[PDB]
């Protein structure tokens, strides 16, 4: 009767304990932190309004005498090391332990999201039972970036939402606006729209999570929106595609990719910088636009514009300057101006990012970066600049930390043929200033998302790196040094 004891006395209790410890308690702790934050604001408002006064008339005897912690990286010329050195001045402290991202046994955490704005963050991941398997759950939530006791930023979650079925939720992207963190997700019954595009329905959903939730907020805390109108223009279908976006007033701009019919799409074989490669042919510059040269649809990057005062979502096309296959992308609000980053899974392996000149249409002043390049297969290996037909690579961010010298930071994989050896670097278009490893050279890695902000007026960057050990994310809070020694 031992099987009965295990299945009746322990089993049910372990199951209930697991629910309480991983869902209910964290939720109550998160909400408690929110109550504290909300009360702090209330108290400050009370003081601001009640402690304001003008002198009263002073009555003397019978006569009345009437007499006469964390903020966005915007606006400051912060001090950083901007010289090239070969010492270790980076301190990549690990803060991942504060998030519910540590798995056990055969539990894979994949397709991570991380976004930050105005001291708040959004985080998401998919848990699977890492190449092919059953999805367990999709966890999407928000929180605050806190000042830890030792002056290290840390991520504290306050509000977590899950879908009724994780197998339908793909490529979520987050934008912060007015104390809510809007997450735009693709809804699919055919799996990832990128690979199964010919059967994708094209519908989108949006989740609005409060970053400062109420105990009985209801729709205040986790509102479920649906997009009843999508303005696609020439595109057959559109979807969100990348870590995070920006806010402009009441308009939210999410990273996105459109699915355009290959036969409608036009290109020019005589208008491609292919004359410098001795081992290629002009049509490679067009065939590379799909995930295969004979695909029905091709991918082209853009933005999904969502106006809170309208609401429909509008797909915004990008210029064809250095046109590449639509790949996961990100738009930052950094040092006073929007900055756009695009991953490159195309033949152009060089890091592709720069200042946004216009948003609609999206026109980007791509930087002349000659140093940073993503890893990939021998068909399109690191530092390849020859037009070829391929489709593979990883997302490597590059957040701008100092505009005057155009110095940016992020995590890159220091390998030619494989996605290996993640290194946090600070760099210029033509130089690397300093580097520090986040893993050994024999450890592989995939997606890397970087969000920089000010903590007590100092620059910190949190880099979310997928590191293999089954693969799990790690979050490194890297301080940017003022001195080069």
């Amino acid at each position: 009767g031992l099987a009965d004891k295990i299945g009746t006395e322990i089993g049910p209790k372990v199951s209930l304990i697991d629910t309480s410890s991983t869902i209910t308690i964290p939720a109550n702790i998160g909400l408690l932190g929110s109550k504290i934050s909300q009360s702090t604001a209330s108290i400050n408002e009370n003081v601001n309004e009640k402690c304001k006064f003008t002198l009263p008339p002073l009555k003397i005897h019978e006569c009345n005498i009437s007499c006469p912690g964390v903020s966005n990286l915007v606006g400051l010329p912060n001090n950083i090391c901007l010289q090239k050195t070969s010492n270790q001045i980076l301190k990549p402290k690990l803060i991942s332990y504060t998030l519910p991202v540590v798995g056990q046994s055969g539990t894979c955490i994949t397709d991570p999201l991380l976004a930050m704005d105005e001291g708040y963050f959004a985080y998401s991941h998919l848990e699977r039972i890492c190449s092919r398997g059953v999805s367990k759950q999709r966890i999407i939530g928000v929180g605050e970036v806190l000042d830890r006791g030792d002056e290290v930023p840390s991520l504290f979650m306050t509000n977590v939402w899950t879908p009724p079925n994780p197998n339908t939720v793909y490529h979520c992207s987050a934008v912060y606006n007015n104390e809510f963190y809007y997450v735009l997700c693709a809804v699919s019954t055919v799996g990832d729209p990128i690979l199964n595009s010919t059967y994708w329905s094209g519908s989108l959903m949006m989740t609005r999570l409060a970053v400062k939730p109420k105990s009985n907020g209801g729709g205040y805390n986790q509102h479920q929106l649906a997009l009843r109108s999508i303005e696609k223009g020439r595109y057959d279908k559109v979807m969100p595609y990348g870590p995070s976006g920006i806010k402009q007033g009441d308009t939210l701009y999410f990273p996105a990719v459109g699915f355009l019919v290959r036969t409608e799409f036009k290109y020019n074989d005589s208008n491609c910088p292919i004359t410098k490669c001795q081992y290629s042919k002009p049509e490679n510059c067009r065939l590379s636009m799909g995930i295969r040269p004979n695909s029905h649809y091709i991918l082209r990057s853009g933005l999904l514009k969502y106006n809170l005062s309208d609401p429909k979502v509008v797909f915004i096309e990008i210029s064809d300057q250095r046109l590449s296959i639509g790949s996961p992308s990100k738009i930052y609000d950094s040092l006073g101006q929007p900055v756009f980053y695009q991953a490159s899974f195309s033949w152009d392996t060089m890091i592709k990012f720069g200042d946004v000149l216009t948003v609609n249409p999206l026109v980007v002043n791509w930087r002349n970066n000659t140093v940073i390049s993503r890893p990939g297969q021998s068909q399109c290996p690191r530092f390849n600049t020859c037009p070829e037909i391929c489709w593979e690579g990883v997302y490597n961010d590059a957040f701008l930390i100092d505009r005057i010298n155009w110095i940016s930071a992020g995590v890159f994989l220091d390998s030619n043929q494989t996605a290996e050896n993640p290194v946090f670097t600070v760099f210029k278009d033509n130089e690397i200033l300093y580097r520090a490893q986040l893993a050994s050279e024999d450890t592989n890695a995939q997606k890397t998302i970087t969000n920089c902000f000010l903590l007590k007026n100092k620059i910190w960057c949190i880099s979310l790196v997928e590191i293999y050990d089954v693969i799990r994310p790690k979050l490194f809070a890297v301080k940017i040094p003022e001195q080069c020694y």
Partner: antibody
Amino acid sequence: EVKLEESGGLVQPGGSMKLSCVASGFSFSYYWMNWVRQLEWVAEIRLKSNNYGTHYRFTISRDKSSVYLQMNNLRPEDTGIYYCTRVITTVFAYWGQGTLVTV
Amino acid sequence: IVLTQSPSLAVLGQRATISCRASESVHDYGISFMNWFQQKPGQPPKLLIYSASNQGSGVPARFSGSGSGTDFSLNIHPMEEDDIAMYFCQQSKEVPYTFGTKLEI
């Protein structure tokens, strides 16, 4: 390539001049613009999001990727070279060629 | 807040030092707001150093600097022929913003 081109530079005392700065190579709508004369700071105008607040006879305004300085009731003390400048996180990183103003 | 700058500097290959004194401290946030520029006849002033010791775009390694509070300086070493110019310190912290010395061989 970032450049600021000034034009509109002799006007007699009591008269007026308007300096027009053409901005290119950057997103004009996201940066503060300032005028400096030769060095002495003259005027600053903030972004639409700051309700075009100004700091300083002269009026500063923005539109065309351009910024303008309206100088009324001119005096000999205003003689010098006026530069159109762009400010990045409080730093006057970019300057135009400059235009000569004589009163 | 106003600035006093000193020395003309009759200084090739030698280290040139230029001092600038603020009437009030300009170091909020731990960030210096004392900037330095290089200016030549026929040309606009070019940013050399912003805040303390941070070089601007295209600025040679020969240019450095330091300072805090009200006491700031520009350090040029070695001085070369191309470094003959007017140098200015700038107060960019508060309105009105304010601002030179002649450095030559």
